Paper text:
Consistent with its absence from primate mt tRNAAla sequences, the human mt AlaRS/tRNAAla system was recently shown to be insensitive to a G3:U70 identity element. For the human mt AlaRS/tRNAAla system we show that loss of the G3:U70 identity element was accompanied by a radical reorganization of the recognition mechanism, away from sequence-specific direct readout in the acceptor stem to sequence-unspecific structural readout of the flexible tRNA elbow. The appended C-Ala domain, which plays an auxiliary role in prokaryotic AlaRSs and is dispensable for aminoacylation in the human cytoplasmic AlaRS system, plays a central role as a folding aid for the intrinsically flexible mt tRNA elbow. Fine-tuned induced-fit adaptation selects mt tRNAAla and rejects non-cognate mt tRNAs.
The model suggested two major contact sites between mt C-Ala and mt tRNAAla. One is in the C-terminal α/β-globular subdomain (aa 873 to C-terminus) containing the glycine-rich “GG” motif. The second is formed by helices α2 and α3 of the N-terminal subdomain (aa 783–872). Both helices are lined with highly conserved basic side chains that form an extended patch of positive surface charges. Due to the 3-helix architecture, helices α2 and α3 can move significantly closer to the tRNA than in the prokaryotic complex, allowing direct contacts with the T-stem and V-loop. In particular, the mt AlaRS-specific Gly825 appears to be important for tight association between C-Ala and tRNA and may explain the sensitivity to V-loop size (see above). Thus, adaptive evolution of the Hs mt AlaRS/tRNAAla recognition system was accompanied by a radical reorganization of its recognition system, moving the center for tRNA recognition from sequence-specific (G3:U70) readout in the acceptor stem to C-Ala-mediated sequence-unspecific readout of the tRNA’s elbow structure.
Residue numbers in the entry: 786 to 986
The structure:
């Protein structure tokens, strides 16, 4: 009873600290993700915690706000880094029919955002990108232009790509993503561009 109320008060104080941290925000995306996870776990604990109902649900309101602004913030920061790298690749490539290259990324979400921005700004171009990860792992994301032939499907594209790397692929005809592991990146890049060109007839 009293102990539960005290714990709830501590949680609220903790909640206040978390909110302050959020206002402050964090430069590292990883720390932003960690904060969102702390929000989810904390809300789950409050859900089954013992305390007066009014305070419990009032705090639930505050913390749900905290999660919305936290997740919105992390999504914005990923959009920022993805935009910067997207411009970095835009400066040196021509808007050809097909652009197949590699870009350094920290997570697959950011890579996907790069592909979507790139296709949004170059509508008549199909895109595939690979990201090297430590310890030999490799990520893949690709998107096919809407104007492109329907015979060209992204899922089969990344399907062959990761299929050569022994990985896995998933998506739809328009967008696809996958994982693999291979020493030579130019082999996967060459297979992707070869296949895609073979379809683009």
């Amino acid at each position: 009873a009293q102990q539960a109320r005290e714990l709830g008060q501590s949680l609220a104080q903790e909640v206040k600290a978390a909110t302050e941290r959020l206002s402050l925000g964090s430069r590292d995306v990883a720390e932003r993700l960690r904060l969102s996870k702390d929000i989810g776990r904390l809300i789950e604990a409050v859900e089954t915690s013992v305390m007066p109902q009014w305070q419990r649900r009032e705090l639930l309101a505050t913390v749900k706000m905290l999660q919305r602004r936290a997740n919105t913030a992390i999504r914005k920061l990923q959009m920022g880094q993805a935009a910067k790298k997207t411009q970095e690749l835009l400066e040196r490539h021509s808007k050809g029919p097909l652009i197949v290259d590699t870009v350094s990324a920290e997570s697959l979400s950011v890579l996907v955002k790069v592909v979507r921005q790139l296709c949004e700004q170059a509508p008549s171009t199909s895109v595939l990108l690979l990201s090297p990860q430590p310890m030999g792992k490799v990520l893949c994301a690709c998107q096919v232009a809407q104007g492109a032939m329907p015979t060209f499907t992204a899922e089969a594209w990344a399907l062959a790509v990761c299929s050569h790397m022994g990985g896995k692929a998933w998506g739809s005809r328009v967008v696809a993503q996958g994982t693999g592991s291979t020493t030579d990146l130019e082999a996967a890049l060459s297979i992707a561009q070869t296949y895609a060109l073979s379809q683009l007839l």
